[PDB]
Structure 1
Amino acid sequence: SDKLYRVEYAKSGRASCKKCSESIPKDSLRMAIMVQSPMFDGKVPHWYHFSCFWKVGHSIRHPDVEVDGFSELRWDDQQKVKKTAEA
């Protein structure tokens, strides 16, 4: 995927939020900025809590196309993403 963002239910509880540095609980809704690695050739996620992600300021117009993983979210959460992005 060449998308800039990723959203998903946390696969583990081990990722640390880049903003607040607190861990992100398994299964919770988390979002990443996908960035190029300096260790190897490929993208790595910078994970944030859902709310922390928005606090650091993004202009995502069409979440469905711009955020990888969007379509695999529960409808409930897809709507929370769209809603949040628009505001």
Structure 2
Amino acid sequence: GSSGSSGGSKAEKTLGDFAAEYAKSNRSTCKGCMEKIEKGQVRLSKKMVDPEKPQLGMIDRWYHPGCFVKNREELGFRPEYSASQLKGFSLLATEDKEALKKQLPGVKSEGKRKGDEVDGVDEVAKKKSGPSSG
């Protein structure tokens, strides 16, 4: 016996599958990092079916705002959808809102980048130690 979700939402231009709101309780746990979700800390959910538990079917998971971004592609979040389109965002506080906008700029062509690394640059003999045998 657990209080179920009331069937009666008011939205016209909002995405259902995607919803964001304050973590009412610290019961749920993220799967991207496998870490409990501290109460109060903003959180989001995505309507999808668990591959490990097909019996349940259409379920609702939860992932920290930071995980939602990193796994924005893996989860299946297209650029056509922004943070302002997250059920609840509008309700959230401006301060928090911007926090999500700065993370999910919506449409943007972001590409991977590479830097540099050491090749060797070995020098003449120097003072060092050595392993031991048996």
Amino acid at match of 1:5: F
Relative to the length of structure 2, the TM-score reads 0.53
1:56 is aligned to 71
- CA gap of 1:68–1:44, structure 2 versus 1, over 3 A, is farther
- The size of the alignment, in residue pairs, is 84
- 1:62 Cα offset (Å): 3.2
Which structure has more relative contact order (CA 8 Å, sep 6+)? It is 1
Query: Highest Rg: 1 or 2?
Result: 2
**What percent identity do the matched residue pairs reach?**
32
- CA gap of 1:80–1:59, structure 2 versus 1, over 3 A, is farther
1:12 is aligned to 25
* Gap regions ≥5 residues in structure 2: 1-8, 10-14, 109-134
Higher helix share: 1
* Gap regions ≥5 residues in structure 1: none
| Ranges of 4+ aligned residues in structure 1 off by more than 4 Å | none
Structure 1 contact 59–85 (Cα < 8 Å) conserved: no
**How big is the alpha-carbon RMSD for the aligned residues of Structure 1 and Structure 2?**
2.3
Query: 1:1-87, aligned counterparts within 5 Å?
Result: 3-35=16-48, 38-39=55-56, 44-57=59-72, 58-60=77-79, 61-65=81-85, 67-86=86-105
